[PDB]
C-alpha cells in the first residue's frame, strides 16, 4: 500500500479520469465542446488527428 500512495500516485491520478474521461466535470467538457464547435460538427474523418491533439494541448 504505502509505496503506491507515496512514491507513486494512484488515487490522485484516479480522480482525473472521473473528471474528464467519465465526463464528471462538465465545465471542461463545456469549454472543450464550445471552443471546438466547428471542427466537431464537421466530419473529422476528413481531418487529421494531430491537429486535434495540438488544440487539446492548449484547450486543457
Amino acid at each position: 500500500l504505502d509505496v503506491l500512495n507515496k512514491k507513486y500516485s494512484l488515487l490522485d491520478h484516479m480522480q482525473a479520469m472521473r473528471r474528464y474521461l467519465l465526463l464528471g466535470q462538465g465545465d471542461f467538457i463545456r469549454h472543450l465542446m464550445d471552443l471546438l464547435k466547428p471542427e466537431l460538427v464537421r466530419p473529422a474523418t476528413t481531418l487529421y488527428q494531430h491537429n486535434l491533439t495540438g488544440i487539446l494541448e492548449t484547450a486543457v
Binding site: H50, N51, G54, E57
Partner: protein, 640 residues
C-alpha cells in the same frame, strides 16, 4: 600417470602468456610425480583351511589397512587402475559369509584413494590458488581417517575387535568419503579451475539441504576455497593494481596501449583493456559482474591522469551460505570510485567550460565571431582549392577570436581550422574550398577524451557545416538586397521569399534544438552519479541534437540541396545584371521567372514532404504563419 603431466605445462604456457611480469613460473620437481610414495595408498597362506573365527580376525586386520589406502593381504589394489578411480580385488577363495560383508565395507577404500591422488595433483602451482585451498581442506579429513583406524587397531590388538563392530564403526565416515569423492570427480571431469570450481561448490552447497552431514562438509570447503579468491577480489576492487600470480580470474588485462596513446578513440577501458570472462564467475557474482570491473577501472582512469585515489575501507570477508555482506561492499566501493572520479572531473580539468566552449563554436553561441570571420573571409573562401594557405586562416582565427569577446573562455587554445573533403555525401567534394566545406578542429586530453572522442567532434562539424551553407547563402541574399538600396516586381517578392525561407530555417533549428536541448543537458549533468551517466547524457544529447535537426532525413532533403543551388544562382546573376547595367526587361525577367519556378517547386515539395512527417507540426505552422504558401496545391494523387 602420464596424461597428467601434459595438462600442467599447457596451463603454464597460458599463464606465462597472460602476464608480462610473471615469467618463469615454477613447478615442483619431477621426482614428486615419479615417486608413488607420496600418496597414502602406496607370508600369506591359503585362507580356505583356516577356521572361521581366525579368518574373521585376519580379514579385519587386512581390511583396516585398505580403508586408509595401503593394500591388504587377501585384498589387492588393482593395477589396471582406471582413470581417476580405484578398484580392489578380494579373493574368491575367502568364505562367502565373511566375503559378502567385506563387499559392503569396500566402497570407502575406493572412495579414499581417488580422493588422495586428487590432493597431490590439484595442489601444485599449475592448477591455481583456489584448488590448493580446496585440497588443503580435504587433507584435514584424510588425517582423521588415519586417526580412527589407529584407535580401532589398538582395540584389535587387545583381542577386542570383530567385523561387526568395525562395520558399525565405519558406517558414518563412509558417507563423508562418498561426498568428497563425488566432488573430486566433478572437479576433475569438467577441467575446472578458478571460479568454475567455485560455481560447482556454490551449487553443491545449495544441493544438500536435507542432510547437514554433507552440507556442512561442502560449506566448510567453500569457506576454505573462497579465501584465496577473496584476496584477488581485494586487489581488483580496492586497487587499480593486481598481482595475479596464477590467472584464473574473471577480469583479465590484455594491453591496449599498442593501438592508441595520448587519446583513446577506442574508449578502450570499457572495451578490451580490462575485460571480463563470464565463465570464471562463481555463478552468484554475475549480478555484480559489471560493477566489479568499473570499480577498479575508474581508479585506473583517474590514476592515469595523475590524481591519487584510495579505497573507502577494506574488508576480507569470507563466504557465508546464501548470505552476502560483500555484495554491499561491491556497492560501497563502486560508489566511492564513481563519486570521487565524478567530483574530480568537474573541478580539476573541468568539462563544463569545455562543453560551453564547444557550444560556442559548433552549435554556435556567438554570431559575432562569425560575422567578423565571414566578411574578412569570403573572398578567400569563394576561390577554389589549392589557393588556400593555413596561416591566413590561422591569423583570421586569432584575430576574430580576440577581436570578438569569445576570448574569455579558457578552452580555445587547442582550436584549429580544417575542412570536410567529402562534404554532404558522408551522411548515411574537395573540388572547391570554402564554397564546399568549412570547419574547425579541437584536440582532446585524457579526462576529456573518454567522453568527447573523435566521432562526436566529427558529428559536431557535420552539423556546423550544414548550418554554414544557410549562414553563407543568407548574407549573399542580404548583399543583393543592399545592392538595390527598371526592376521586375516578381524579383522583389522572390528575393523576399528566399530570404524569409532561409532565415526561418535557421531560426527554427536554433530555437528548437540548440537552446532547448542544451537546457536539458544542463540539467542532466547536474544529476549524473557515475561515468556511465555522464556517458549516457552526452550520447543521448548528441543523438537527440542530430536527430532533432533537419540533418537526418532518409534522402537528406534533395529539395534542400537543389534549393540552395538555385539561391546561389539568383544572388550571382541578379548582382551581375546590376553591375553590368551600371557600367533588358526580358533578359532579366526570363531568368527571374525560371528561378521563381524552381524555388516554388522545391518549396512546395518540401512542405509536402514535411506534412508526411506530421509538437512537430509547428514547422509548417511557423513557416507559413500568415496563411500564404501554407498549401498551394491539394497534392495530386494517382488514378489507380
Amino acid at each position: 600417470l602420464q596424461q597428467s603431466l601434459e595438462l600442467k605445462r599447457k596451463m603454464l604456457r597460458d599463464k606465462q602468456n597472460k602476464k608480462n611480469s610473471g615469467q618463469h613460473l615454477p613447478i615442483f620437481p619431477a621426482w614428486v610425480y615419479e615417486r608413488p610414495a607420496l600418496i597414502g595408498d602406496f607370508t600369506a597362506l591359503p585362507i580356505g583351511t583356516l577356521p572361521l573365527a581366525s579368518q574373521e580376525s585376519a580379514v579385519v586386520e587386512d581390511l583396516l589397512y585398505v580403508l586408509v589406502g595401503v593394500d591388504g593381504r587377501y585384498v589387492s589394489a588393482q593395477p589396471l587402475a582406471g582413470r581417476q578411480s580405484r578398484t580392489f580385488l578380494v579373493d574368491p577363495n575367502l568364505d562367502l559369509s565373511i566375503r559378502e560383508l567385506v563387499h559392503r565395507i569396500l566402497p570407502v577404500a575406493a572412495s579414499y584413494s581417488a580422493v588422495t591422488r586428487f590432493i597431490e595433483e590439484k595442489s601444485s602451482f599449475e592448477y591455481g590458488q583456489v584448488n590448493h585451498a580446496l585440497a588443503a581442506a580435504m587433507r584435514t579429513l584424510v588425517k582423521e581417517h588415519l586417526i580412527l583406524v589407529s584407535q580401532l587397531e589398538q582395540l584389535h590388538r587387545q583381542g577386542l575387535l570383530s567385523l561387526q563392530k568395525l562395520w558399525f564403526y565405519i558406517q558414518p565416515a563412509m558417507r563423508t568419503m562418498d561426498i568428497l569423492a563425488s566432488l573430486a570427480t566433478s572437479v576433475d571431469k569438467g577441467e575446472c579451475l578458478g571460479g568454475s570450481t567455485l560455481s560447482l561448490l556454490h551449487d553443491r552447497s545449495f544441493s544438500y539441504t536435507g542432510d547437514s552431514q554433507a552440507q556442512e562438509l561442502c560449506l566448510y570447503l567453500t569457506k576454505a576455497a573462497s579465501a584465496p579468491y577473496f584476496e584477488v577480489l581485494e586487489k581488483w576492487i580496492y586497487r587499480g593494481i593486481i598481482h595475479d600470480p596464477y590467472s584464473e580470474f574473471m577480469v583479465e588485462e590484455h594491453e591496449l596501449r599498442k593501438e592508441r596513446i595520448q587519446e583513446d578513440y577506442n574508449d578502450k577501458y570499457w572495451d578490451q583493456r580490462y575485460t571480463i570472462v563470464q565463465q570464471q564467475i562463481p555463478s552468484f557474482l554475475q549480478k555484480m559482474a559489471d560493477k566489479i570491473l568499473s570499480t577498479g577501472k575508474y581508479l585506473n582512469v583517474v590514476r592515469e591522469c595523475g590524481h591519487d585515489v584510495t579505497c573507502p575501507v577494506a574488508k576480507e570477508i569470507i563466504y557465508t551460505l546464501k548470505e552476502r555482506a560483500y555484495v554491499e561492499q561491491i556497492e560501497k566501493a563502486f560508489n566511492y570510485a564513481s563519486k570521487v572520479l565524478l567530483d574530480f572531473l568537474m573541478e580539476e580539468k573541468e568539462l563544463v567550460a569545455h562543453l560551453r566552449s564547444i557550444k560556442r563554436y559548433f552549435l554556435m553561441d556567438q554570431g559575432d565571431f562569425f560575422v567578423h570571420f565571414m566578411d574578412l573571409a569570403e573572398e578567400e573562401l569563394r576561390k577554389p582549392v589549392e589557393d588556400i594557405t593555413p596561416p591566413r586562416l590561422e591569423a583570421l582565427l586569432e584575430l576574430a577570436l580576440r577581436m570578438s569577446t569569445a576570448n574569455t573562455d579558457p578552452f580555445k587554445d587547442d582550436l584549429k581550422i580544417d575542412l570536410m573533403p567529402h562534404d554532404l555525401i558522408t551522411q548515411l567534394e574537395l573540388a572547391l574550398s570554402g564554397l564546399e566545406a568549412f570547419s574547425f578542429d579541437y584536440i582532446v586530453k585524457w579526462p576529456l577524451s573518454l567522453i568527447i572522442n573523435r566521432k562526436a567532434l566529427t558529428r559536431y562539424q557535420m552539423l556546423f557545416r550544414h548550418m554554414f551553407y544557410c549562414k553563407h547563402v543568407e548574407r549573399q541574399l542580404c548583399s543583393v538586397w543592399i545592392s538595390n538600396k527598371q526592376w521586375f516586381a516578381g524579383a522583389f517578392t522572390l528575393r523576399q521569399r528566399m530570404l524569409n525561407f532561409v532565415q526561418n530555417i535557421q531560426y527554427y533549428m536554433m530555437f528548437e534544438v540548440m537552446e532547448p536541448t542544451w537546457h536539458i543537458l544542463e540539467k542532466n549533468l547536474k544529476s549524473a552519479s557515475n561515468i556511465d551517466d555522464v556517458l549516457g547524457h552526452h550520447t543521448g544529447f548528441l543523438d537527440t541534437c542530430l536527430k532533432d535537426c533537419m540533418l537526418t532525413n532518409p534522402e537528406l532533403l534533395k529539395v534542400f540541396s537543389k534549393l540552395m543551388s538555385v539561391c546561389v544562382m539568383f544572388t550571382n546573376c541578379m548582382q551581375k545584371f546590376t553591375q553590368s547595367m551600371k557600367l533588358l526587361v526580358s533578359g532579366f525577367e526570363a531568368t527571374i521567372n525560371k528561378f521563381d519556378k524552381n524555388f516554388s517547386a522545391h518549396l512546395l515539395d518540401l512542405l509536402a514532404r514535411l506534412s508526411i512527417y506530421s509538437g512537430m507540426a509547428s514547422v509548417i505552422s511557423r513557416l507559413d504563419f500568415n496563411g500564404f504558401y501554407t498549401e498551394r496545391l491539394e497534392r495530386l494523387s494517382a488514378e489507380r
